[PDB]
Amino acid sequence: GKLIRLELFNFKSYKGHHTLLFGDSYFTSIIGPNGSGKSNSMDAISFVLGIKSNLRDLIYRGRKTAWVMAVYEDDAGELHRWKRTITANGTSEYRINDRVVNAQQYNEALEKENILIKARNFLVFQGDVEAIASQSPQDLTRLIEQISGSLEYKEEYERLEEEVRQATEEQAYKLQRRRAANS
Amino acid sequence: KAIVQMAKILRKELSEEKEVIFTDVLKSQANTEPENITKREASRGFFDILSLATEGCIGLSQTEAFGNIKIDAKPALFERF
Amino acid sequence: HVRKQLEQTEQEFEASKAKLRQARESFQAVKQKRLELFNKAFTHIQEQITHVYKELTRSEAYPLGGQAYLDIEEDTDTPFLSGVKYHAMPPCKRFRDMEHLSGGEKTMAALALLFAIHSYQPSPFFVLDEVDCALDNANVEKIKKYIREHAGPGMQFIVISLKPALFQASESLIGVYRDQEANTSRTLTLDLRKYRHH
Amino acid sequence: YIKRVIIKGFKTYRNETIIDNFSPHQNVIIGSNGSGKSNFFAAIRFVLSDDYSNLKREERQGLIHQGSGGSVMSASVEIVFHDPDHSMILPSGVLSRGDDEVTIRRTVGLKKDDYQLNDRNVTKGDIVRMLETAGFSMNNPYNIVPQGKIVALTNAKDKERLQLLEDVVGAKSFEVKLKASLKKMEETEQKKIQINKEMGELNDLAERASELDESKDSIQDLIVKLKQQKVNAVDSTFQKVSENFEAVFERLVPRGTAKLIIHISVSFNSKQNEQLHVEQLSGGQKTVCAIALILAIQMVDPASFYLFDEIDACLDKQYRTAVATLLKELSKNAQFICTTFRTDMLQVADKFFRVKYECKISTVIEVNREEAIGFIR
Numbered sequence A: 001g002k003l004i005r006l007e008l009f010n011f012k013s014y015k016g017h018h019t020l021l022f023g024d025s026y027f028t029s030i031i032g033p034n035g036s037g038k039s040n041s042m043d044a045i046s047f048v049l050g051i052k053s054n055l056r057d058l059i060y061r062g063r064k065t066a067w068v069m070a071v072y073e074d075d076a077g078e079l080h081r082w083k084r085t086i087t088a089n090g091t092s093e094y095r096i097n098d099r100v101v102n103a104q105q106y107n108e109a110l111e112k113e114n115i116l117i118k119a120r121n122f123l124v125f126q127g128d129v130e131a132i133a134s135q136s137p138q139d140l141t142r143l144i145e146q147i148s149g150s151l152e153y154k155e156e157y158e159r160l161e162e163e164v165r166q167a168t169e170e171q172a173y174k175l176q177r178r179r180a181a182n183s
Numbered sequence B: 001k002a003i004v005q006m007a008k009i010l011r012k013e014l015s016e017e018k019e020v021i022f023t024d025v026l027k028s029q030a031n032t033e034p035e036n037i038t039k040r041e042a043s044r045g046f047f048d049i050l051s052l053a054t055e056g057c058i059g060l061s062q063t064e065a066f067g068n069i070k071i072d073a074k075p076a077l078f079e080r081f
Numbered sequence C: 001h002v003r004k005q006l007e008q009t010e011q012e013f014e015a016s017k018a019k020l021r022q023a024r025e026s027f028q029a030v031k032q033k034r035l036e037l038f039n040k041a042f043t044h045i046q047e048q049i050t051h052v053y054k055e056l057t058r059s060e061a062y063p064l065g066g067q068a069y070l071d072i073e074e075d076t077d078t079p080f081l082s083g084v085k086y087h088a089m090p091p092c093k094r095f096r097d098m099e100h101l102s103g104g105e106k107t108m109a110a111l112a113l114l115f116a117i118h119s120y121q122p123s124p125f126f127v128l129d130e131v132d133c134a135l136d137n138a139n140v141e142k143i144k145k146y147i148r149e150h151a152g153p154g155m156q157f158i159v160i161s162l163k164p165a166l167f168q169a170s171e172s173l174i175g176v177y178r179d180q181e182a183n184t185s186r187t188l189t190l191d192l193r194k195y196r197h198h
Numbered sequence D: 001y002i003k004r005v006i007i008k009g010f011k012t013y014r015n016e017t018i019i020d021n022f023s024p025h026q027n028v029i030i031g032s033n034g035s036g037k038s039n040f041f042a043a044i045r046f047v048l049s050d051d052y053s054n055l056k057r058e059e060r061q062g063l064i065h066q067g068s069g070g071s072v073m074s075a076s077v078e079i080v081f082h083d084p085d086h087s088m089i090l091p092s093g094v095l096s097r098g099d100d101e102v103t104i105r106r107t108v109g110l111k112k113d114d115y116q117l118n119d120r121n122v123t124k125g126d127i128v129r130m131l132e133t134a135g136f137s138m139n140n141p142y143n144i145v146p147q148g149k150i151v152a153l154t155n156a157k158d159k160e161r162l163q164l165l166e167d168v169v170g171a172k173s174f175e176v177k178l179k180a181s182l183k184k185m186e187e188t189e190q191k192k193i194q195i196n197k198e199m200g201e202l203n204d205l206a207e208r209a210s211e212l213d214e215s216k217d218s219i220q221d222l223i224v225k226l227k228q229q230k231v232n233a234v235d236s237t238f239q240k241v242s243e244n245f246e247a248v249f250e251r252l253v254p255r256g257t258a259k260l261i262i263h264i265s266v267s268f269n270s271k272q273n274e275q276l277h278v279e280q281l282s283g284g285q286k287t288v289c290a291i292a293l294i295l296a297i298q299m300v301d302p303a304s305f306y307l308f309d310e311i312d313a314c315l316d317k318q319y320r321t322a323v324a325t326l327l328k329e330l331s332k333n334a335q336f337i338c339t340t341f342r343t344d345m346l347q348v349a350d351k352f353f354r355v356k357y358e359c360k361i362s363t364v365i366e367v368n369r370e371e372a373i374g375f376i377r
């Protein structure tokens, strides 16, 4: 499908209700001078889909609450309103189609339409090209381990590495003190 | 260079009228009918008015999705470009 | 007295060996799962990185473009534990060390790597920051010719850009200006299908 | 100040490449991505500064031209100055303002080839000795702005900026000398504690124990007094930096205030607003504050030639206009070699060089008014 629009309310620079309309356009560029909030709109895109990577810092400062809603239409034609809200105490409420949803079902509804935040395939941050141009081969292995979906089963891999290593080492010294008991 | 030209067209359109439509300034600058205006000119003028607006010299109003842009004058427009 | 001690130590040793086999075959199972899930993504990006770099480095003066490939240092049993080296060779250029490349050539290789990583699990949209602002006009025009040829149904492009050679060819503009007397950001939008080319 | 550069056999250059006739005011080198306009700066750094100090075979092969199997022998860069009075080591046939025999060709080979001093092979020490008395320094953080430094000073946190300020002061002559006395402290402690306890076993050795106790008192005296010297230098340099930064930022941005608060964080804004450090900033004003800090670092010790590889990355019309006007005002005292892609430092500069790209070799030409033609095509 495609993103129809974002609706922002008291997100970083945007005092009150603002609307970022994409419409029928499959190539829409965000322009403006420095300090204007283009990267704030990209951070609204990044935040409305569930990136945590200071959650009170996103509310607007003049000198209460904040929310951002992504409207997305799939291949059938139905809208999927995804609203994230920063409430008064620093907790984030998730809503799909005006219905309150927890974290895992929200990310499951995103992964249903091939939006994988856990892979982060589709966001290029300011300076990420210079970072990946200055990356190490281990950093690039980490990135392909990220996007492959195989960054999961990592802690299970290392845990069971320790399990089989303790098991074979205890087996070997079991053999040695067993022949010592036979001695 | 560019913003001075845009500033002159805005001082001219906003000297007589209280509000002016962006597409009228674009037709005035291109010196042709709107069907012949090109993407490079429209984008250049659009970015120029965003820059002029960010400095606090002009006002911008748009009330419909992909609708007309209404431009109004501020006092600071006639002393800083 | 020692014989039943011997058999009990032997059999709990055998039970430890049996749970060793349990954890070991479970380790080989999760290792094979991790290996296949890494290997299919590796094969996909290795086959697409060449085509995206040929699309990013060809022009009128050189129609075939450069060539790029990423590969395992030490392919023995676990490619996911070894490093991947990314070789990116522009037109008429060849090195032994990759960091001798330019700013624009590094930005081109980085953008080719990001576009080849992205089309493994293709998201319905793709958002780009100001990656164009370390580039000359020819590389910005090649970025525009790549994006205009790929933006469509199933792959939407939203770029944050300051270079007019890039955002002059978008399908619509979202112009964000900071209203300073109210201390807010504001948006305007413009349809670039109303205007002609050239 | 600097007069003409002669580059032969370097990384993307021909059999000999002469760039000449640039006035001591601001001069701009342009090209395209892959031309070598950042490799000319790596030809300048190869002689004057100390980036390429002592190199093994891979770094030498990175320097030497791999040009289609030809001229892989050597690389050489000569830089000619002009001065009414300039420092020197030995007279060596003093040319009339042609002091190039002192900044010698810097010949490197596949093996360790040692360069000369007008037909006499002479160590690097005499070169850095004459550049000592020429008002320069071979490890300054301002005379080299390479590709990726201003983006590094926009992602450096507060302690790394304080360490770069500490190397701007050069106050590790009060710190690593204090680290040598720290070596003295650890060895003296775990030696002479055992020495005085075995002397107290025997106890005229209590005299030796007493003056080693007063030697540890002397260690205390020197460490607290050199910490006093370190803070005495650092806060004076910071009192210079903070106000230079205030003046530079109020000249760049004519609508805001900018200080430094030492704990480094930079409390600034763009109008009558609050404080925001480098976590909560747009990339535009982040690179504005980074180049304002570096234009403050120049003002603690000004030199005669500077190198600006894309000092205005991707800012704005107003920010490039302000940086170009401030650099034109600053070019009344020193050379300002720069690199641009945008014409805001082309309408105000004086000399314009173009690096003509081919795909293995490159050469530099000089016309002045075809450059804005080359960028506003």
Ligand SMILES: Nc1ncnc2c1ncn2[C@@H]1O[C@H](COP(=O)(O)OP(=O)(O)OP(O)(O)=S)[C@@H](O)[C@H]1O
Pocket: A011, A012, A013, A032, A033, A034, A035, A036, A037, A038, A039, A040, A041, A057, A058, A059, A060, A061, C130, D276, D280, D281, D282, D283, D284, D285
């Ligand atoms: N929570 C907040 N409340 C109010 N203002 C904020 C907040 N967070 C950030 N800002 C301001 O918004 C600015 C960021 O504006 P952006 O529009 O993101 O910059 P940008 O212009 O899009 O990126 P550049 O400059 O073009 S690379 C910061 O520099 C702050 O001045």
Ligand SMILES: Nc1ncnc2c1ncn2[C@@H]1O[C@H](COP(=O)(O)OP(=O)(O)OP(O)(O)=S)[C@@H](O)[C@H]1O
Pocket: C093, C100, C101, C102, C103, C104, C105, C134, D011, D012, D032, D033, D034, D035, D036, D037, D038, D039, D040, D061, D062, D063, D064, D065, D066, D067, D147, D310, D360
């Ligand atoms: N030993 C070498 N033999 C041949 N070519 C080399 C050698 N070392 C470097 N080069 C080339 O020299 C060039 C160095 O890049 P530069 O053009 O200096 O960067 P730049 O393009 O000037 O700066 P940008 O555009 O802002 S990234 C590249 O084209 C390298 O391939």
Ligand SMILES: [Mg+2]
Pocket: A038, A039, A126, C130, D282, D283, D284
């Ligand atoms: Mg930004």
Ligand SMILES: [Mg+2]
Pocket: C102, C103, D037, D038, D147, D309
């Ligand atoms: Mg460069």
